[PDB]
Each structure stands twice: as structure tokens, then as C-alpha cells.
Design an enzyme around this catalytic site. Structure first.
Site, PDB file in Angstrom:
ATOM      1  CD  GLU A 171      -2.763  -1.014   2.700  1.00  0.00           C
ATOM      2  OE1 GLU A 171      -3.490  -2.307   2.102  1.00  0.00           O
ATOM      3  OE2 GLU A 171      -3.176   0.000   3.413  1.00  0.00           O
ATOM      4  CG  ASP A 203      -1.347  -2.277   5.479  1.00  0.00           C
ATOM      5  OD1 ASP A 203      -0.544  -3.226   5.164  1.00  0.00           O
ATOM      6  OD2 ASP A 203      -1.942  -1.629   5.513  1.00  0.00           O
ATOM      7  CG  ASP A 253      -7.213  -2.746   6.682  1.00  0.00           C
ATOM      8  OD1 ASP A 253      -6.479  -2.889   5.486  1.00  0.00           O
ATOM      9  OD2 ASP A 253      -7.113  -1.204   7.046  1.00  0.00           O
ATOM     10  CG  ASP A 289     -10.191   0.067   4.296  1.00  0.00           C
ATOM     11  OD1 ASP A 289     -10.944   1.312   3.385  1.00  0.00           O
ATOM     12  OD2 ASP A 289     -10.789   1.354   5.159  1.00  0.00           O
TER      13      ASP A 289
HETATM   14 MN   LIG Z   1      -3.384   0.109   5.217  1.00  0.00          MN
END
Ligand SMILES: [Mn+2]
Ligand SMILES: O=c1ccc2ccc(F)c3c2n1C[C@H]3CN1CCC(NCc2cc3c(nn2)OCCO3)CC1
Ligand SMILES: [Mn+2]
Lengths: 481, 189, 483, 189
Positions: B19, B92, B94, B96
Site C-alpha cells: 500500500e 494490509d 484490513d 481497506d
Molecule cells: Mn493500510
DNA sequence: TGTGCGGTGAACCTACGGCT
DNA sequence: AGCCGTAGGTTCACCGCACA
């Protein structure tokens, strides 16, 4: 309503110059810290972020420090904390960090929301007994908090971790040192106030960088130790080896202090392309977390790799000089100090800290003893104690009667009243007595220390010696003739 | 922005997509720089399903991925020119990060479909309990997600082209109703 | 775990992202009118005692505690969210009290968090009132190290009062703000008539009420929105035509539509004049001051009809903008399109539950207290016996056991006697305890009375709602003109 | 970047120079936009006593100020073309704010000297105990610092042109030693 | 000329729905 | 069109001193 331009310039610039000198870029000779570094450490101490506890959020740390003690940018605070966690910047790291904390290639640390931190075990020695009236506290920037003016610093941090600072009209550049050597040096000084630089140098051989490497000669070190200024030539650890068949390569496993590895490599590549250096056929950074720093420089078949190396020392940061300029705040003012002056101010700071701690422990011990003597009287006449309280309508009347009847102070009477019923059990009654006897011996032990300056100095030695054994390590930087 | 590896043999080389720099930092410190390249992006990448070509070819992150892979796009796509045989999506752990993975796959499917068909696109499985990769120590990232001896990588497979074309339209396309209908019919609260 | 089908991956990653956005980010809960970010902010302010009577606390510290304990997302999202709740042009009833640069209607962002400070507003205390009386369910946080509230007591109808606007996945929401006095009156009429109609509710709730005042055209759009949850409402600026000297006139705007950027509106008006898409305008100034208030001046050319220019400005610029009502909110953790009644219903049921759970909590707490007092009465009446029993005991365990069997005491009663200080043995304590115990018995009775009758409980909600109304209710700001 | 005022009569107009947008916000909300212009900068400005002629003219903040004043610099300076009869320096009330003032003063003296001689340059006086103007409420900044009725503006006056040339060279010049000596002689701890 | 480190300061990508 | 507002992401101007 009118302001002269010459006066405005002199007053405002002086205001700024002074502030950066005494409260920003220069470290104190006693704890070797700058205001931001001291505020970060204190923040971790007050929030109880000790190495036995779990990692706390960088965001909360920075947020608390900024609001309570450091009225400046959050990026400056965070970046200072990160530097303290890097084993390539700090000879003895002060911050134990979790997550991305930067690299030798100049890569910055991850955003503060992602990283976590706490104290290292050694930082506990900087903060030891800071709440035992050893150092002077001062008002923060807004009158709403209290901050330490300096740290107990139970190890010579200024020289151990060194410091770099650009101010106004002056700058500072102190190199890190081996902790074992520094403490030994301090021990010699305490046994000989008139010791020379030459003699101190039998203990302290020279700088010791976290990034190891080599130092050329003892003249630069000697000049720096004697005057506070000197040029010290650093050099990478490099070897020449075969790689088959008839071809050789230069392998670098240690680089000079504060040198960016990625930057150093590009500089070599630039010279190869510009044809400013002959004989290099390949350049690879094989550095690995698992294998350590390893920079490989392939040499053309039959070319002299020793000549190529010597050329790299002359034209690339593979050899870099460290220009010593030992300026620190002594009694609040900027001053150029030599090795001995620095050691003297630190030793004198250690004497005051230990004496102040002893005086504090004494006062508190006496206050507790006095309170224990009150409870002991109460236990001896508990029946009488109850009757006095029972016949009293208010606490105020109970107090006055307890003081009157049992010849107690106001404090002793309050303690008896605050006493819970559970204190009356067999084991609890024995605890009040046990604590009192232990406390009397303790009081006596502390008085023996204050009654003799030599005993105090010996305790300073014994406590420094204890830290040397636990945190002392081997020399990393090789000093060659 | 690309942090390449030493080797130039694409069969053994691999490129990790993260990211940003916070994640890229831990990735660069824990990687094997001999065969593992790293390309940190800039967060949420453009949804190619909703954007027109001019918009796509001018987006910085799209350009770097194309330049890094060296395969070209659409009809000019040449698999023989790939610089890595393992394109690893490592966003990541998560919600998002899951969304950026969908945005990347969308791009790979509409412009580099043969790359997937060859089994060159993979999905890393970093451990949960971390807001980002930057929160992990370099060794922890290496041992659990990047080290071929211990890591579990998910190879992306294309089964039915027709169903895949519909899935990319429904979820990433401009028609909100179809996407709202999918959510309703599959959401378990 | 060797392979993964692209289609399966896309569906399961996408639905995961979409579900999270829908239920935990962009949509407000119908009960307290909050999105997780804002709820976590207000809760953080409450846990640190950042009450209106206390001094302002540093914004950076606020954001940092909230980020670490409850909200694992970027700091900007948290800060900017706190900033909005502090603006009188964004929130009909501000939830946060701000000191420093907190933005402007002209689109200016707040000053960096290091400079600003904040605290709870008095009305926010009402959202958190009774949060520590087992009124609402707590849940574990993102990492399991903290606890947070799933919803706030919300002693006032916050969802409609302050409204909300969010863009999710597959859906969006746009709920306008309303007048608190009107809302509470509506809730009251509803509690007196479960069959009350929309048209009858509108006798109380005349329509939206914007923090930026201004005007609304017609009632049809408002009626449609209340009836179905969807409708287009025409917002219009407050503008007048006045003389400026020498037979020349000007247009003066003192109030603009909700969510419209003033500087941006002015620039679009200047663009039309420059591109000649409108005639009659000779000057355009923004005379807004703290002292003056919002004041935009539009000078008209001599002899040009100023009313015609105004009309054109409404059609051609955001001087007249529509609010597209789309009332989507979380009802039992699902997104649902709701009308005015359904919103008031779910809120009233939340209030009935909060007040009930509060009375039940106070009842347990009181019975526990009466039980302890019974153990203290026995202790003080036979104090000498109690004291010898403790002294003859070597450990605490032994003392507890002796007290329990000899004096007919529970484990809790015995413990409270051991924790009792010697100053509690004074001459007036025995009577002081007797008074409290008697008061408690009476108090316990009062609480049981309420829980045994549903009408006394509902009436209690009414009184507490009416109390909020009288203390926080204000005049209508937006004028509804027909039509 | 310049948030100009309504009136175009320089005799009654004034321009406040602030450190940035955090300070600029409280400034814009608290002013009188009829006569009070505001130009937020971006912190420490270029030191003209140490920088080269070409670097100064290329500097983004330097150009904004010249464009704002509309007088030109050096030999092309014309006072009759001055846009504001009051150029007010209003940095933050901290050591770094005092430093930025000296930087601006240095700039006004070397390129717009006649602006100081005509009494056009002023120094604002915001209250101490504030890290920045963005920390203050719009109203309290106006009443205390910007309101013509209650503000105490300090007019910059040039007395000796010889002593002034020696002061700017000493404090802002490229010679360190002279500046170190000044500190030693005038330092009070 | 460019770098080390505590300081002042700020911008612009992207997803998403609706209308020495 | 962009713009309403919670989300993922990050870059570059300036000061100051002493060293090659
Ligand atoms: Mn992130
Ligand atoms: O202005 C600009 C302009 C351009 C630009 C480019 C790239 C770029 F990265 C950035 C840029 N910027 C700014 C910067 C982006 N900022 C966003 C917010 C972020 N916040 C940190 C933070 C603060 C806290 C806190 N936790 N974290 O909690 C404790 C107290 O305050 C810090 C980085
Ligand atoms: Mn400032």
C-alpha cells in the site's frame, strides 16, 4: 508605538539564537540530552511504559509529549523518538520500538499510527530515582505541568551515545563511546582528581560507533580529547577475496558512522559510469537481515583490487572523517569541553544525585517510622483506643482526644482513625512491627552514608560498577595504527 | 519508486505490491534482495472498470506497474517479456486492504488477463491483528509471509471467463443497483 | 491453501469491504444518530472527563487516545470528524466545543491539531447520560484490550436533530437536520398515539431546520420525504433588494443553503458575469464579518430589474440548491430506508429501553447497598464482640469465617466490616446508617413501582424528554414558505 | 494564495503576513475584509543575505509578496504603485516567529528599503502564551491584535543607514564568527 | 556543494452514491 | 460536473554550522 529596525533585529534574533542554544540543539553535559529527547523519555516514564510492560502506541506517546512538555511539531518529536530506537544511530538505544523504524538506507519510519514503543532496559538507568528528589523539576511551557530539568542519568550518556546539533553561531559533534571504557575512566577519575588526559585514555581508547568499522591512528582522537576539537578518519571494514577463476571482489561488511549505505553505493556507480574509476565490473548490495551488511564490488580480471580499494577511499564515503566539536551545556551555557571536563561534570552530577536520594529516603523513612510508632501505641492500648473513638460524636473530637490521651501528633491520630478493622488480625499486627524494625535498620544504614563523604563516593562507584557489568559490552570500532 | 532485485532471471524473480512506504519499509528490510522486488503504491488505486483509457494511462501507479512488469497491456501484452513470474499482492490485513486487492485484480483482469491465466499472479497472506505491515517487525513479516520455506501464497485461478466478466461488471462497474442487489442477497450480519 | 478462484476472491473480499463500510463507517445508527468515528470521539471525551465545566483539552491528545483505543484508522479522519461536530454551520446542535481555528463556511480547514483544543458541549452530556448505569451494551474493541459502547443512551433524538450524510457501498444516506423543540413534541404525540399519522406528526415537525437558516420552497418535497424517506427539498438563500444611492440598487444575501461553500458559490456567480451568461451585475463583494455576519452584496446596474437577476441567480447558481433526502440508517445493524414515523418509533423504543435498564440498575445497586448496611448495623450494635473476633484471628480468611457464622453474615457483609475504618465507630455513625437504610427501603419501593407499571415508565421518559426540550429547545431558523 | 480586500485605495488598505493556513484561518475570520488583506506564507522564508540573486527571484513566497505589494524590487521600485500603506508582519508569538520576522525584515531592507523609509512596514503584537495564531479564536485575535481601535502596531523606523547595514550583515550574513561574538557579548542566562 | 538533525510551514492522489 | 464526508495512501519548500 515606534520600533527601531536595528534594535528589533538585535532583540528578536538574540531571542531566537539563545533559545536554540539552550533549549534545542545543544545537549546538557549531565544527561547528554536535548530538550526533545528528555521530554520523550520522561513521557514514557510518567505513563509507565517500562520494558516489562507491553508496547504502547507512538501516537499516544507523541500526543502526550507534545501537549504536556513539547510545544512544537509532532513530526520533530516522532522523528527524534525513532532515532533513539535505531541500533545504527544509537550506540546504546534508548527506545525499544515495534514495527518499521527506518533503515541505514535513509528510509524513514512508518507513520506513527502504525508503530509502537517503550523504554529499553538501559533507559531505566537514566530515569532511576527521578521521583526521589534527585533532580530539580520546573514548570512546563504553560504553567500546567512539571518537567525535569535534567535526568538522574546513572551512566555517562553524553559520551556513550554522543550528539549532533546545529544551532546559531555554533554547532556540536560528539562521538559515541564504549560504555565499559567510559565507566572505567570515571572510576579512575574518582580515585584521582588530578588524572591526565593521557591516563584517562588508558581506559577510553577512542570513539566506539554502533556501525563498528575502523579508525586510522591515535592523533585525531588525542587532539579531540585534549582540546574538544579534532579530525578522526573513519574507514569501512573491507576485504579482498577470490570469486573464481582468477577474478576477485571487494567485500564491505561495515560502513562509516552516519553514512547512508544506499547513497554510498550510488556514488560508486556514478563514478563507474562517468569513467572516473577503473576496474569495476559489477556493484551489488547483498545486505540481508539474516546475513548482515554485505556490499560486493566485482573487480575486472587481472586488475589490482588493492589499488581500486584505495581509490574508493579517496573518492567515496567509504572513508569519511568525523570532525569532533565537543560543545555542551555546562551550567546552562554552551562550552567547548575536553574529555576530562566532560567526565568531571558527569561525576559531580552523580555525587549530587546519590546524596539527594539518600536524603530523600531518610526523610520518608522517618515519616513512616513516626506513623508506625502511632499504630504501635494503638495496638498496645487498642481497648482504650476504641473507647476514646466510641465516646466521640465527630472525627474532629476523636482526633483531639486521641492526641490528648495518647500524646499523639496530628498525623499519628489520623493514621489510627484511617486504620481498617482488618489491620487487627494476627498477621497484620505482626506486619506493623516487622516493618518498623526493618525501617530502623534502614534509617541507620542511610545515616552512615551521609556522615562520611568517602562512603558516599564508594556507593557511587559500586552503583556505576553494577551498571558496567550489566550493560557493558565489547568494543565494535577497531582503532588501527 | 520501484525497489528491484539483483537477479535478472524472471523465472526465479518476484515482485511484491504494498500500500505504501510504511508497509514498504518493513518489506524492504525483511526481503531477500536477490530475487524479491518491491513496488510500494499510494493507497487506493483507480477502479479501471469505472475509468476511461485516458484516465488509466495517466495514473502514476498504473504506469509504474506496467513499467515494472514489462509485459505491455491489452493486445500488445507479451508474456515472454515479464520481469517477474510472481506478482504478489500484499496489501494490509484490513477491510481497506481487501478493497485495494479487488482494485488491483480488476486492473490485472482487464489489461493483463493472460498474466493471470499463466498463474503469475499471487496473493500474500499476512497475519491479522495488524493495522498495516508497518506495524510488524521485518523478521516477523519475512518468516510468516515472504519466506518461501514457510509462507503460504495463494495462486489466482481463472475458472469460467463468462462468470468472471460478469463478476467484475457487477461489483466494480458503474451500475449501483446490481452491486446493491449482490450485497442484499449475500450479506450475513 | 494453494489456490484461489478469482471470482470467489472478488466476491468475498468485496462483500467484506462493503459490509464494513455499511455497518461500521458511513451509515449512522438510528438510535443515537452516530457513525462509529463520532461515537468513539464522544466516548473518549467522556472517559477522560472532558466535560463542559472543565478546561479545553488538547486536540492532539484527544485524537491520539481515540485512535489507540477505539478507532484504528488515520488521524485525519478522526480529527476532521471532531472538527465538524464543533462547527455551528455544520451541526444544528453542536456536539463539540472548540477553541482555536476550526474552519469556515468558505471551505477553510481547521488549524493543525497541535494548535486546537476541544471539549464536550452541554448537549452532548445528554447523549452520554446514564451510560454507566447499564443502559447500553458494551463490546470489545478492535484488539480486545479495551471496551467501547455499541450505542449511546441518546437522551435526545440526535439522528433527526443533527442529521447525517454518508456515501457507502451500494447505497448512501442524506438525512437533514431538524428543530429539537419540534422533534421532542413529535415524540411526545407519538408516545400518546401509536397510530399517529405522518400528516398529524407534521403538526409538530413542520420540516427540516438548517444550522445555516435560509428558506425552503413548498411542502410537497417535505411531505414526500417524510412519507417515504425520499424527497427533493428546495433550499433558498435569504436575499433582499435594497437601495445603494443615486437610483441604484443591490442584492444582499445574509443566509445561504445548508452544506454550500460561500466562497465557491461567489466564484460561480463571478464566472457567470465574466462569461456573460447573466447581465445586470456591476459588482460582487463578500462583506462577511464577525460583527456583520454573513453578507454577500450583488450590485445591480441602474434601471435593471433586480428581481429578475435574483430569479436567474437562483436557477443558475447554488444560491438555490436542492437537498435530496434519502433517509437510510442502521436498524438492528442493517441498512434500512425509513420514513419520519419509523425513525421516531425506533428512537422512542430506544428511550423506553434505556430508562428501564437504568431503573433496573439502580434497583440492584440499592438492594446491594441495603444488604451491606444490614451487616454494618449488626457490627456497630455488637462492636466489642466483633473486635475480639478479629483480634483472636490470625488471618483474614479466619476472621471472615468467624464473622459469618457467629453473627449470621454473608461473605460481602463480613468483608465490608473488615474494610471499615476506625473513624466509622464515632457516636453519630449508628444513627447516620439507620437514616440511609430507611431512605433506601423507601427508594427501593419507588423503583419497583415504576417497573411494575408500563405507564409510569413511559411517562417518566416523557418528563425527561420534556426537560431536555425546555432546557435545550430553541427557535426555528429555516423559514418554510409556500410554495 | 493572497486573500485580498474589497477597497482599492492603498491609503486605507493593509496586508497581514502570517506563517501559514493554521494561522491564516483565525486571521481571515477575524479581519475586516474591506481594508485588511492577508497573505499566508509557508514558515521560515528564504534568507536573502545568504542566497544568490537568481534563487531569490525564483522563490515562490518571495514572488507572492512582490506581486502583493506591486512595487517591484531594487532599481525598479516605485512607491506610488504600492498596493498597501501598511505591510504588517504578524508571525507567531514564539522564538521561531521572532526568527521569521527577522527573515522578512532582512528581505524588506535589501530589496524594498524605501518601503521601510516611508513608514509602510509594521510589526503586529499578538498575545504571548499561544503557540500560534491558529490556537486563538477569531474574535480574541481581532480585538487584541488587528482591531484599529485597540491594537498596538509597532512602526518600523530606520535611524542610521550605516549601523543598519552592519547589523543585517552581522546577524544574517555568511560569516559565523561575527554572529557567535555578538551572542557571547549580549547573552544573558 | 550536500549532508547530518530539530525546527517553521504546507497538498493532492484514490473509492464510493446521488443528483568535505 | 463536481461535491457532500469517512476511508487508503504519501513530498517538498525553508534555517542553521562545519566538515570534504
Ligand atoms: Mn493500510
Ligand atoms: O501538508 C501537507 C502537504 C503535502 C504533503 C505530502 C505528503 C505528506 F505526507 C504530507 C503532506 N502534508 C502533510 C503530510 C500528511 N500528514 C497527514 C496527517 C499525519 N498525521 C500525523 C499525526 C499527527 C498526530 C498524531 N498522529 N499522527 O497523533 C498525535 C498528535 O498529532 C501527518 C502527515
Ligand atoms: Mn509558527
Amino acid at each position: 508605538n515606534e520600533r527601531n529596525i536595528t534594535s528589533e533585529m538585535r532583540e528578536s534574533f538574540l531571542d531566537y539564537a539563545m533559545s536554540v542554544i539552550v533549549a534545542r540543539a545543544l545537549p546538557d553535559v549531565r544527561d547528554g540530552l536535548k530538550p526533545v529527547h528528555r521530554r520523550i523519555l520522561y513521557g514514557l516514564n510518567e505513563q509507565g511504559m517500562t520494558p516489562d510492560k507491553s508496547y504502547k502506541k507512538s501516537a499516544r506517546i507523541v500526543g502526550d509529549v507534545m501537549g504536556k512538555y513539547h510545544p512544537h511539531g509532532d513530526s520533530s518529536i516522532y522523528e527524534a523518538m525513532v532515532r533513539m530506537a535505531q541500533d545504527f544511530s544509537y550506540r546504546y538505544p534508548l527506545v525499544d520500538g515495534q514495527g518499521n523504524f527506518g533503515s541505514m538506507d535513509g528510509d524513514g519510519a512508518a507513520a506513527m499510527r502504525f508503530t509502537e514503543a517503550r523504554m529499553t532496559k538501559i533507559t531505566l538507568e537514566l530515569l532511576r530515582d527521578i521521583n526521589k528528589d534527585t533532580i530539580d523539576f520546573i514548570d512546563n511551557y504553560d504553567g500546567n505541568e512539571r518537567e525535569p530539568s535534567v535526568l538522574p542519568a546513572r551512566f555517562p550518556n553524553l559520551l556513550a551515545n554522543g550528539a549532533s546539533g546545529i544551532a546559531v553561531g555554533m554547532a556540536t559533534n560528539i562521538p559515541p563511546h564504549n560504555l565499559t571504557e567510559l565507566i572505567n575512566g570515571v572510576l579512575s577519575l574518582s580515585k584521582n582528581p588530578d588524572i591526565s588526559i593521557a591516563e584517562l585514555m588508558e581506559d577510553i581508547e577512542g570513539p566506539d560507533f554502533p556501525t563498528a568499522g575502523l579508525i586510522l591512528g591515535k592523533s585525531g582522537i588525542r587532539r579531540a580529547y585534549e582540546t574538544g576539537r579534532g579530525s578522526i578518519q573513519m574507514r569501512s571494514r573491507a576485504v579482498i577475496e577470490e570469486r573464481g577463476g582468477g577474478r576477485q571482489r571487494i567485500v564491505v561488511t561495515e560502513i562509516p558512522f552516519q553514512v547512508n549505505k544506499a547513497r554510498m553505493i550510488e556514488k560508486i556507480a556514478e563514478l563507474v559510469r562517468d569513467k572516473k574509476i577503473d576496474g569495476i565490473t559489477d556493484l551489488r548490495d547483498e545486505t540481508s537481515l539474516r546475513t548482515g551488511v554485505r556490499v560486493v564490488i566485482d573487480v575486472r580480471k587481472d586488475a589490482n583490487a588493492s589499488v581500486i580499494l584505495n581509490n574508493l577511499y579517496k573518492q567515496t564515503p567509504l572513508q569519511t572523517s568525523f570532525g569532533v566539536n565537543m560543545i555542551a551545556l555546562v551550567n546552562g551555557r554552551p562550552k567547548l569541553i575536553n574529555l576530562k571536563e566532560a567526565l568531571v561534570h558527569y561525576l559531580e552530577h552523580q555525587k549530587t544525585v546519590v546524596r539527594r536520594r539518600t536524603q530523600y529516603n531518610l526523610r520518608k523513612a522517618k515519616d513512616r517510622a513516626h506513623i508506625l510508632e502511632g499504630l504501635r501505641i494503638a495496638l498496645d492500648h487498642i481497648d482504650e483506643i476504641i473507647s476514646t473513638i466510641r465516646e466521640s460524636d465527630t472525627d474532629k473530637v476523636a482526633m483531639e482526644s486521641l492526641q490528648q490521651r495518647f500524646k499523639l501528633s496530628e498525623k499519628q491520630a489520623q493514621a489510627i482513625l484511617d486504620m481498617r478493622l482488618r489491620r487487627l488480625t494476627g498477621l497484620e499486627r505482626d506486619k506493623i512491627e516487622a516493618e518498623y524494625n526493618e525501617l530502623l535498620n534502614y534509617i541507620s544504614e542511610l545515616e552512615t552514608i551521609l556522615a562520611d563523604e568517602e562512603v558516599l563516593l564508594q556507593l557511587v562507584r559500586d552503583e556505576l560498577t553494577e551498571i558496567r557489568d550489566r550493560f557493558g559490552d565489547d568494543r565494535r570500532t577497531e582503532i588501527q595504527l | 519508486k520501484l525497489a528491484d532485485c539483483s537477479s535478472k532471471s524472471p523465472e526465479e524473480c518476484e515482485i511484491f505490491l504494498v500500500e505504501g512506504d510504511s508497509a514498504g519499509g518493513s518489506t524492504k528490510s525483511g526481503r531477500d534482495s536477490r530475487t524479491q522486488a518491491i513496488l510500494p503504491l499510494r493507497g487506493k488505486i483507480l477502479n479501471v472498470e469505472k475509468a476511461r483509457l485516458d484516465r488509466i494511462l495517466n495514473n502514476n501507479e498504473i504506469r509504474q506497474m506496467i513499467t515494472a512488469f514489462g509485459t505491455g497491456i491489452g493486445g500488445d501484452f507479451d508474456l515472454a517479456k515479464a520481469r517477474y513470474h510472481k506478482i504478489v499482492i500484499m496489501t494490509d490485513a484490513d477491510v481497506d486492504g481487501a478493497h485495494i486487492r479487488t482494485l488491483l485484480l480488476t486492473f490485472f483482469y482487464r489489461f493483463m488477463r493472460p498474466l493471470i491465466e499463466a498463474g503469475y499472479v499471487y496473493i500474500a497472506q499476512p497475519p491479522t491483528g495488524y493495522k498495516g505491515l508497518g506495524e510488524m517487525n521485518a523478521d516477523q513479516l519475512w518468516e510468516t509471509t515472504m519466506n518461501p520455506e514457510h509462507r503460504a501464497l495463494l495462486q489466482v485461478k481463472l475458472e469460467d471467463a463468462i462468470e468472471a466478466d460478469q463478476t467484475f461488471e457487477m461489483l466494480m462497474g458503474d451500475v449501483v443497483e446490481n452491486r446493491r442487489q449482490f450485497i442484499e442477497d449475500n450479506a450475513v450480519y
